[PDB]
Design a protein around this ligand. Structure first.
Ligand SMILES: Nc1ncnc2c1ncn2[C@@H]1O[C@H](COP(=O)(O)OP(=O)(O)OP(=O)(O)O)[C@@H](O)[C@H]1O
Ligand SMILES: Nc1ncnc2c1ncn2[C@@H]1O[C@H](COP(=O)(O)OP(=O)(O)OP(=O)(O)O)[C@@H](O)[C@H]1O
Ligand SMILES: Nc1ncnc2c1ncn2[C@@H]1O[C@H](COP(=O)(O)OP(=O)(O)O)[C@@H](O)[C@H]1O
Ligand SMILES: [Mg+2]
Ligand SMILES: [Mg+2]
Lengths: 183, 73, 723, 394, 384
């Protein structure tokens, strides 16, 4: 396989034996950040928001045909808002857990940076790891985030052809975010 | 006077006059008059320098803006 | 056959050449005579597209078809139409194969249609220095007023207008009296790689004559700017005392006014090497004038000095050069006892056949008698060097060039029935008669007799020469064998050959084109920057200077100055310092004056070949970089019929033009009206350049009614019956 | 008639080309190999000649020599410094100090001096190729061309009219005006006609990421320029490289000012640049520094103003000499409709009015096709106009 | 391979029969010549005997280095992978044309001589900016503009598809095209129709990602963008939302406003520099046209300036016909009440209602969309 270890003799540098499976760089990325893996069974009293978040995310994976019967474009982006400490992260972690989605969150950190690319002059280089774990979900916390999301939303607007990739922004106080994000 | 040494200069020059029509210059700009006056005479093909060749060289070093301005006086 | 031009007058008209040719392929006249008079009453607008469909089929054919279809091609602009101005240039097509008198009967047909001056002027413009000369005895008839006093104006006054090209118009564009700075463009090797001031070879001074020599064509006259050629004229290098004197003939080229005057201020030195280079340059100056300069005046007085070196030698080369366009028999018989002397100055005798072959291409079999006698008297009683082989059979092919009849092959190959080193000349007169046609049955007998045979140093010079005759039949099938040759040689000879490829087979590309296109312009330095130092490495350094052989200057200074960079330390200056700068100074001879590539109007020859082909035979291989080839390496090819087509030539010479230069046309049969060509973005009005594939048309309802094919001295009359 | 007969006789011989060229060897589309019948020179001979006698000669850099003895001090990339000696094949002459040399792997001795490092981002800005703008395309500003052309090329083409008169000609020149006026256009005509090296520098290329990295690029420019006999440096958009020193509080834009100071030192004082002529071109000169506007660096101050009337009528004749027009139109009427317009706008009028002919059907433009272009370009794009806040250069 | 480029008669003529039968002799005589090499000089097999000789010459360990210069007499200074660089020689089976400073090569293991070059694995930013497939439906998906849809074809599509109309005019096409108007009117929507239609390579970048956190990393990113655009093809560079380079200030950018400025000077170069530009078309789009630099919008850099208005109330009805085409719309609804709901509802609002009303039906598992779906839809979409 490409990106797989091997053994190697040293006199002639002849290939010796396959050395197993080291890591995906996406696996190491979430291992650094350590999101609190959650489920529906630890959700305290949010029954109507669970029904809202399933309509936009859970349904257009298991039943993509169900929107062709209605003939609308399938949704792509979700905004979660409210005061902090009310369960934004665990609800987003729950939905990606229960339909087998690679829950990727970005923070724009730099320990993370070595696994995406050497310089990564854009943010859009994240999509190479995203379209390889194809039913994935990009997550963002709470003004560098509001420029990050507009770069993500414009690629998945028709220019990106791979389906099953969604973004979720979680922040408080929606009246101060960008009006370009309020179109 | 120093930078006019290697040029063929006619004795029609008045450095007392030339220093007085050149106010507010520095040692670079007073050097830069002698080179431009030493080139205007090559345009008209003259060999020696006259007074007006310095006077025309001043107007190039000041770098004025020509805009049709003769409606004064 | 009338039904095709009956129903629609579509592009099924060119199906009538598919009906008249397939019917009685060899007796084409009996079907064409039934279709000539039918076409004489058919249409006068449906002439020109069937006319070009004929010359499309006449571009290449069987010999008996090329005999017959090209004389049926003649009367259709004469009997049906009277466009009648494409006669002289496009029956140079019909002069050599059918009958030399036939185009002379069409030279009579020129002198018949005497209405009035304008088309009359332009047809006979080309009769002097554009595809042939030898016509200046047929216009001294009983009407010597102006219409039969055109001949003098044809001879040297429009040639003086071609001097007036470089007098007025080329000084105005760029050209100063000494550009001189291509030597200055050899600039940064002193700082590229440490220090400089190292190259102190004396053979670099032989190339330093071309800091003067090559840059000074087209009135590059110099007064004390020949001091590099003055101080070296009195310093050393006897064959460079010939070179700095013969370089002055290139400096005042196409001249009659002051060329003899500039020689005499450096002539009087009492030297065998300075005078015989300066008096050889006298034939260079009047080359194309052919007026009273010296039919037997100066160079005959040079030649009668002889008991010794180049006075004996350097006098016959200049007259055979200046009178190459002549067919004058008298001085041909002045210079026939040069061959009939049997004086043992052998390098004089080799250029003797090279001088007389330049004059005539037809008759005087006594020349062919005079050459073969001294050939059997000397070459039979020896088995030695190519000085015999590269020189003495070469004038014979020049005396029998350009006819696919295969009678001259019966004459000449049965004439020197001999041992195979004297039968080196088996292929000389064989294919020199076979310059441009399609006769691929000759191409198989050009390879299959001696393909390789592994030939342990036996006829390698012959198989190089067998490939030398593969170098024509590729310049004028009009691009058709051109791509079909570069596919061949890049796999056959230079790729998987032993001696024919690695030594010699690159010289096709110096004969296929000086055009310059990156298919072969990038295929050659693969074998050059990889020097192949293991072989007699000047063989590939022979391919150095004659890959820069392509004129019409380009970006190719990148290819050469980078090889000029590696050519300083490596690729040593002891045998190549003359050569790399000979390569470098060649493309930019001047900015202009490069049409030396044997395609006029559209494709006719204008030889040309007689002046060029001796030097491509001269580089075989070694020992003429120092002594003997310095007669040839300077001033061999001098048929530069210069460059441009932007000229007005209305009577006052007051118009400029309304021009529009483009990429070459692509139309064979398309919709009416046919779009000619497609590079419209350039539009000029004045004496600007010709270029490689250029078709130039006009506008402004000037109607350009003169000659309508091409031909670079249109009279440019005007007419405006279109409001 | 012979429909398939000309087809299959064409098609098999196109195949028979491929069927035997696979039996020669051009095939096996490589990962970095050669054509097979091209390397045959090193097949037996130079294989065992350019490899087995010839050695590797690791390259170094010399610190200094010393007296009485060779005893050179050498330096390599990360490893130590050694004391070395020459070979027999080189003189001790051209082993001067601070010079890269090649050195064997066992004895550590010097084989050959090397040409120095060229720092390849300065290598890409030598022009190597000339553009196709002639001085016949810069019509309307003939006096500006004459006053420019007498500085750049006449001391190069004739370096004798000045020396015998005894004058040292000016060296520096800047070109300034509103945008779209002809500054970059007139610079292309100079690189067309000249013959020396023409090294271009766009001022936005000297901004680097580390400290002082921009100033070293100025030197490596002026090092290789002094090696040449004559060179012609072109600076474009130099309002990015330095406006003025204004340092206040938190040192902001301190880094770009040091790059601007090193450029100043390479132009004047202490064993000068010699035969190097510079040529700047800016858009707003009022921001520039007084120590850079000093003559001795920027002697000539050529102005590019707007064309007056005959400048404008000449520009219409340039950009419409090569287009299918009605014969009976007058350009002098058009130039009276564009009072304060640039040469770049006039070309856009001529290109737009040819589009209206392409809009309906026709093949040649009319006078009313021009007038439908003027009120769109001059008067309907007048909201943007780009000029009136740059005439005041702010 | 590229043996003869002449195809021009295109009929059943004898000329097409003559030419290819001439070429028939140029091939067989070339075949029979090279056949007699191995007949008289066998000496090898040449399928492997030259090959295995090369393969035994080059060592089985093959180290990877880096070019930094060339001295053309087949030896060059190359950089090893650690940082210690050598002065090794170059072979003859090396095809000395594909060698640039910075190209990854193959070295010997013993004397480190340059054996072969390595095909580069590029790039993790070309594939970022290069649009892979055609985005969406055609020009018929737009509706209502019909005046500037002609305009963009005039400057992009028609110069590419019909290169005869500008030539018969003797003209060159207009260079630059900008698109401006209120937000949500179809600026980004029209660019997808171009990338649907064209056969050029299509590069997209947003104006917010032109600004970088390091000094001078901004203008480096622009110079290598137009390098990518020029080195491919006739190409189309689409730069969207370019007012965002000057409005929003970010604390990542260490240089302040005078690093935004130096980037725009480089962008001002790459549109109308003095260099030979080539066949690159530039499309730009914004909604705050009054903010950016007027020197960038001068003719010569951007020639065509296209305004987008708000949708007119009979073009609004066309948009509802588009977004409600393939939905099973119940006959309860009347679209003409929906049109004048907001007096200046954009084309984006219409899709924002039509997508939302479908989402209300799936809450009740229905298949057709009723009137009260739309009644609570504009309360959800517009009014907040
Ligand atoms: N005097 C002129 N004659 C002909 N064309 C002109 C003239 N002035 C400008 N142009 C046109 O303007 C364009 C070049 O403008 P140029 O780049 O020189 O502007 P500039 O003065 O450098 O300002 P900027 O730096 O903003 O580009 C060319 O397309 C050229 O055809
Ligand atoms: N005139 C229109 N016809 C049909 N659909 C439209 C129209 N205008 C907008 N839309 C719809 O609105 C959506 C978004 O439009 P788009 O983003 O292109 O507007 P914009 O002006 O580019 O937005 P922004 O100003 O935020 O970049 C498109 O997907 C399209 O379906
Ligand atoms: N509704 C809830 N039910 C159960 N636990 C919750 C809830 N809201 C918050 N928590 C607790 O809060 C933590 C998650 O933080 P969270 O509230 O997701 O941050 P945010 O402010 O981003 O929403 C978890 O450890 C969880 O135990
Ligand atoms: Mg400019
Ligand atoms: Mg948009």
């Amino acid at each position: 396989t490409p990106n797989c270890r091997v053994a190697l003799r040293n006199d002639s540098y002849t290939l010796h034996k396959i050395l197993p499976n080291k890591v995906d760089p996406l696996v190491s990325l979430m291992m650094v950040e350590k999101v609190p893996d959650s489920t529906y069974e630890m959700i305290g009293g949010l029954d109507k928001q669970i029904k809202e978040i399933k309509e936009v995310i859970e349904l257009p994976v298991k039943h993509p045909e169900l929107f062709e019967a209605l003939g609308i474009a399938q949704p792509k982006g979700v905004l979660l808002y409210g005061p902090p400490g009310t369960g934004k992260t665990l609800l987003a972690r729950a939905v990606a857990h229960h339909t087998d989605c690679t829950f990727i969150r970005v923070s724009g950190s730099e320990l993370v940076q070595k696994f995406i690319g050497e310089g990564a002059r854009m943010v859009r280089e994240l999509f190479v790891m995203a379209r390889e774990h194809a039913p994935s979900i990009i997550f963002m916390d709470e003004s560098e985030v509001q420029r990050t999301m507009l770069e993500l939303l414009n690629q998945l607007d028709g220019f990106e052809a791979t389906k099953n990739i969604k973004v979720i922004m979680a922040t408080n106080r929606i009246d101060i975010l960008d009006s370009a994000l309020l179109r | 006077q120093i930078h006019s040494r290697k040029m063929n200069v006619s004795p029609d020059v008045n450095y007392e006059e030339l220093a007085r029509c050149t106010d507010d210059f520095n040692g670079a700009q007073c050097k830069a008059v002698c080179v431009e006056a030493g080139m205007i005479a090559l345009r008209r093909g003259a060999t020696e320098l006259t007074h007006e060749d310095y006077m025309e060289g001043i107007l190039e070093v000041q770098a004025k803006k020509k805009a049709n301005l003769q409606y004064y006086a | 056959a009338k039904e095709w031009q009956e129903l629609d007058d579509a592009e099924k008209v060119q199906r009538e050449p598919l009906l008249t040719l397939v019917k009685e392929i060899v007796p084409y006249n009996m079907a064409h005579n039934a279709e000539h008079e039918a076409c004489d009453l058919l249409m006068e607008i449906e002439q020109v597209d069937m006319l070009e469909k004929d010359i499309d089929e006449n571009a290449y054919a069987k010999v008996c078809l090329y005999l017959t279809s090209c004389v049926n091609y003649v009367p259709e602009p004469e009997n049906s139409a009277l466009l009648r101005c494409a006669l002289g240039v496009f029956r140079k097509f019909s002069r050599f194969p059918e009958a030399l008198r036939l185009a002379l009967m069409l030279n009579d047909m020129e002198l018949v249609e005497d209405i009035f001056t304008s088309c009359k002027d332009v047809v006979v413009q080309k009769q002097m220095a554009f595809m042939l000369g030898r016509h200046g005895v047929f216009l001294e008839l009983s009407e010597d007023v102006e219409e039969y006093e055109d001949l003098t104006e044809i001879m040297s006054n429009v040639q003086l207008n071609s001097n007036f090209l470089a007098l007025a118009r080329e000084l105005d564009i760029m050209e100063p009296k000494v550009p001189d700075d291509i030597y200055k463009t050899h600039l940064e090797n002193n700082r590229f790689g440490g220090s400089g001031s190292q190259v102190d070879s004396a053979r670099m001074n032989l190339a330093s004559s071309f800091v003067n020599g090559f840059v000074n064509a087209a009135f590059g006259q110099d007064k004390l700017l020949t001091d590099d050629g003055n101080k070296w004229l009195y310093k050393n290098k006897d064959h460079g005392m010939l070179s700095a004197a013969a370089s002055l003939g290139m400096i005042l080229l196409w001249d009659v006014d002051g060329g003899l005057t500039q020689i005499d201020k450096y002539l009087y030195s009492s030297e065998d090497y300075i005078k015989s280079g300066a008096l050889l340059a006298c034939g260079i100056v009047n080359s194309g004038v052919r007026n009273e300069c010296d039919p037997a005046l100066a160079l005959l007085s040079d030649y009668v000095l002889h008991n010794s070196n180049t006075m004996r030698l350097g006098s016959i080369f200049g007259l055979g050069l200046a009178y190459a366009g002549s067919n004058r028999e008298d001085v041909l018989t002045l210079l026939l006892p040069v061959m009939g002397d049997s004086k043992s100055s052998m390098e004089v005798a080799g250029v003797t056949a090279l001088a007389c072959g330049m004059i005539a291409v037809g008759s005087c079999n006594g020349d062919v008698t005079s050459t073969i006698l001294q050939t059997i008297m000397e070459k039979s009683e020896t088995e030695l060097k190519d000085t015999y082989a590269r020189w003495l059979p070469l004038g014979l092919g020049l005396n029998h060039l350009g006819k696919g009849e295969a009678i001259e092959a019966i004459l000449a190959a049965l004439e020197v029935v001999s041992e195979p080193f004297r039968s080196f000349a088996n292929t000389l007169v064989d294919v020199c008669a076979y310059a441009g046609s399609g006769n691929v049955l000759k191409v198989q007998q050009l390879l299959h007799i001696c393909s390789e045979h592994f030939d342990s140093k036996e006829k390698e010079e012959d198989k190089d020469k067998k490939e030398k005759k593969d170098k024509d039949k590729k310049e004028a099938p009009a691009d058709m064998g051109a791509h079909q040759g570069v596919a061949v040689l890049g796999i056959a000879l230079i790729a998987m050959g032993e001696e024919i490829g690695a030594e010699m087979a690159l010289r096709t590309f110096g004969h296929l084109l000086r055009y310059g296109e990156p298919t072969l312009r990038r295929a050659v330095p693969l074998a050059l920057a990889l020097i192949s130092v293991s072989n007699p490495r000047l063989n590939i350094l022979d391919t150095l200077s004659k890959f820069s052989h392509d004129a019409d200057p380009e970006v190719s200074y990148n290819s050469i100055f980078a090889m000029g960079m590696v050519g300083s330390g490596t690729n040593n200056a002891r045998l190549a310092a003359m050569l790399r700068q000979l390569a470098q100074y060649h493309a930019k001879d001047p900015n202009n004056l490069f049409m030396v590539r044997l395609a006029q109007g559209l494709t006719h020859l204008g030889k040309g070949t007689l002046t060029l082909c001796p030097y491509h035979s001269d580089r075989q291989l070694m020992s003429q970089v120092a002594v003997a080839g310095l007669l040839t390496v300077l001033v061999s090819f001098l048929d530069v019929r210069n460059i441009i087509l932007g000229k007005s030539h209305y009577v006052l010479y007051g118009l400029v033009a309304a021009m529009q230069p483009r990429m070459l046309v692509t139309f064979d049969e398309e919709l009416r009206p046919l779009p000619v060509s497609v590079r419209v973005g350039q539009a000029v009005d004045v004496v600007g350049q010709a270029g490689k594939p250029k078709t130039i048309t006009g506008f402004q309802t000037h109607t350009t009614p003169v000659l309508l094919a091409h031909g670079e001295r249109a009279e440019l009359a005007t007419e405006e019956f279109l409001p | 008639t012979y429909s398939r007969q000309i087809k299959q006789v064409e098609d098999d011989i196109q195949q028979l080309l491929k069927k035997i060229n696979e039996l020669t060897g051009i095939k096996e589309s490589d990962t970095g190999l050669a054509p097979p019948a091209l390397w045959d020179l090193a097949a037996d001979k130079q294989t065992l000649q350019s490899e087995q006698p010839l050695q590797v000669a690791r390259c170094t850099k010399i610190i200094n020599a010393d007296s009485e003895d060779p005893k050179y001090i050498i330096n390599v990339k990360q490893f130590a410094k050694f004391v070395v000696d020459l070979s027999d094949q080189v003189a001790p002459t051209d082993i001067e100090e601070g010079m890269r040399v090649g050195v064997d792997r066992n004895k550590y001795q010097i084989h050959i001096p090397l040409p120095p490092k060229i720092d390849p981002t300065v290598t890409m800005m030598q022009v190597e190729e000339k553009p196709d703008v002639t001085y016949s395309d810069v019509g309307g500003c003939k006096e500006q061309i004459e006053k420019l052309r007498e500085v750049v090329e006449t001391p190069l083409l004739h370096p004798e009219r000045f020396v015998n008169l005894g004058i040292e000609p000016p060296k520096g020149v800047l070109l300034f005006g509103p945008p779209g006026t002809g500054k970059t256009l007139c610079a292309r005509a100079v690189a067309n006609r000249t013959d020396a090296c023409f090294i271009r520098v766009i001022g936005s290329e000297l901004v680097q990421k580390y400290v002082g990295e921009g100033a070293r690029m100025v030197r490596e420019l002026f090092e290789m320029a002094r090696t040449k006999k004559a060179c012609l440096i072109f600076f474009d958009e130099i309002d990015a490289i330095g406006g003025a020193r204004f340092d206040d509080g938190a040192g902001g834009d301190n880094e770009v000012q040091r790059t601007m100071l090193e450029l100043i030192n390479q132009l004047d004082g202490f064993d000068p640049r010699g035969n190097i002529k510079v040529l700047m071109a800016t858009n707003r000169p009022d921001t520039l520094d007084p120590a850079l506007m000093r003559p001795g660096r920027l002697d000539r101050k050529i102005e590019f103003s707007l064309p007056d009337l005959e400048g404008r009528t000449h520009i219409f004749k340039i950009h419409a000499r090569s287009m299918s027009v009605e014969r009976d139109i007058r350009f002098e009427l058009l130039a009276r409709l564009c009072p304060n317009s640039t040469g770049a706008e006039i070309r856009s009028v001529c290109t737009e009015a040819g589009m209206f002919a392409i809009r309906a059907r026709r093949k040649i433009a009319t006078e009313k096709d021009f007038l439908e272009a003027v009120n769109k370009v001059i008067k309907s794009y007048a909201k943007f106009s780009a000029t009136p806040r740059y005439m005041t250069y702010n | 391979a590229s043996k003869l480029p002449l195809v021009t008669p295109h009929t059943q003529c004898r000329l097409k029969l003559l030419k290819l039968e001439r070429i028939k002799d140029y091939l067989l005589m070339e075949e029979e010549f090279i056949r007699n090499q191995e007949q008289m000089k066998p000496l090898e097999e040449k399928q492997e005997e030259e090959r295995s000789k090369v393969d035994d010459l080059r060592g089985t360990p093959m180290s990877v280095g880096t070019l930094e210069e060339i001295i053309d007499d087949n030896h060059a200074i190359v950089s090893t992978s650690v940082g210690s660089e050598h002065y090794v020689s170059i072979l003859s089976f090396v095809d000395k044309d594909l060698l640039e400073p910075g190209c990854s090569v193959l070295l010997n293991h013993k004397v480190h001589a340059v054996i072969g070059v390595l095909m580069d694995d590029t790039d993790p930013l070309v594939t970022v900016m290069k649009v892979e497939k055609a985005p969406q439906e055609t020009y018929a998906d737009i509706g209502g503009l019909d005046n500037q849809i002609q305009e963009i074809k005039e400057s992009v599509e028609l110069p590419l598809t019909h290169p005869e109309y500008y030539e018969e005019m003797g003209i060159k096409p207009p260079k630059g095209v900008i698109l401006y108007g209120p937000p949500g009117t179809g600026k980004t929507l029209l660019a997808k129709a171009v990338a649907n239609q064209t056969s050029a390579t299509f590069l997209r970048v947003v104006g917010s990602e032109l600004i970088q956190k390091y000094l001078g990393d901004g203008p480096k990113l622009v110079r290598e963008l137009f390098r990518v655009a020029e080195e491919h093809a006739p190409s189309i560079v689409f730069i969207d939302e370019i007012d965002a380079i000057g409005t929003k200030r970010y604390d990542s950018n260490s240089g302040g406003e005078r690093e935004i400025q130096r980037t725009m000077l480089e962008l001002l170069n790459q549109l109308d520099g003095f260099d030979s530009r080539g066949d690159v078309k530039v499309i730009m789009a914004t909604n705050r046209i009054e903010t950016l630099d007027p020197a960038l919008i001068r003719p010569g850099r951007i020639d065509r300036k296209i305004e987008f208005p708000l949708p007119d109330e009979k073009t609004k009805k066309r948009i509802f016909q588009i977004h409600t085409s393939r939905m099973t719309l119940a006959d309860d609804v009347t679209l003409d009440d929906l049109i004048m709901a907001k007096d200046d509802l954009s084309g984006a609002d219409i899709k924002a209602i039509c997508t939302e009303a479908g989402l209300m039906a799936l809450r009740e598992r229905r298949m057709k969309v009723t009137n009260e779906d739309f009644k609570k839809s504009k309360e959800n979409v517009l009014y907040k």
